[PDB]
Amino acid sequence: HMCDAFVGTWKLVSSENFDDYMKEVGVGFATRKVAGMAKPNMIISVNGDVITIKSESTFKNTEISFILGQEFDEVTADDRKVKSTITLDGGVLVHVQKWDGKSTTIKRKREDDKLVVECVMKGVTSTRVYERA
Numbered sequence: 001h002m003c004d005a006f007v008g009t010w011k012l013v014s015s016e017n018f019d020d021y022m023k024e025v026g027v028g029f030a031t032r033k034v035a036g037m038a039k040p041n042m043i044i045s046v047n048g049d050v051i052t053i054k055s056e057s058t059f060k061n062t063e064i065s066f067i068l069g070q071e072f073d074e075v076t077a078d079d080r081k082v083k084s085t086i087t088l089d090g091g092v093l094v095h096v097q098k099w100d101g102k103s104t105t106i107k108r109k110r111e112d113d114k115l116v117v118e119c120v121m122k123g124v125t126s127t128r129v130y131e132r133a
């Protein structure tokens with residue numbers, strides 16, 4: 001019942017500073033432009049201890065499945081090969097990606113009727129707001 005309030009189908013409704021976040025992570029120009037235009041649907045489900053998060057857009061369809069606290073391999077939408085760990089911290093899903101000596105954190109939280117995604121790399125934050133589809 002750990003993630004019940006996250007489960008469902010969510011659609012992107014607003015983005016701020018995402019291009020700059022992608023620049024900080026190292027995403028190249030053409031990927032940034034195409035990715036920045038996307039309006040993904042995020043589909044979150046839980047089966048037992050396994051959480052699955054899908055992102056589906058004209059840019060890319062991605063999928064991760066994981067157990068909280070248990071590291072896994074992820075290929076990101078921009079094709080980084082990262083080691084990821086997702087935990088729950090005070091009701092916030094905290095997703096840390098490590099690659100090439102670098103780190104970025106993506107936080108997902110329920111706030112009112114929204115699911116708010118905060119992507120942070122060094123001093124650059126991007127906020128992406130999703131609502132139920």
Ligand SMILES: CCCCCC[C@@H]1C(=O)Nc2ccc(Br)cc2[C@H]1C(=O)O
Nearest residue numbers: 035038040055059077078106117119128
């Ligand atoms: C090239 C983009 C790399 C960073 C993606 C970060 C976030 C994510 O975790 N998944 C995802 C996948 C595709 C696109 Br476009 C945007 C997102 C973001 C979000 O949920 O809105």
Ligand SMILES: [Br-]
Nearest residue numbers: 038040057059
């Ligand atoms: Br996307």
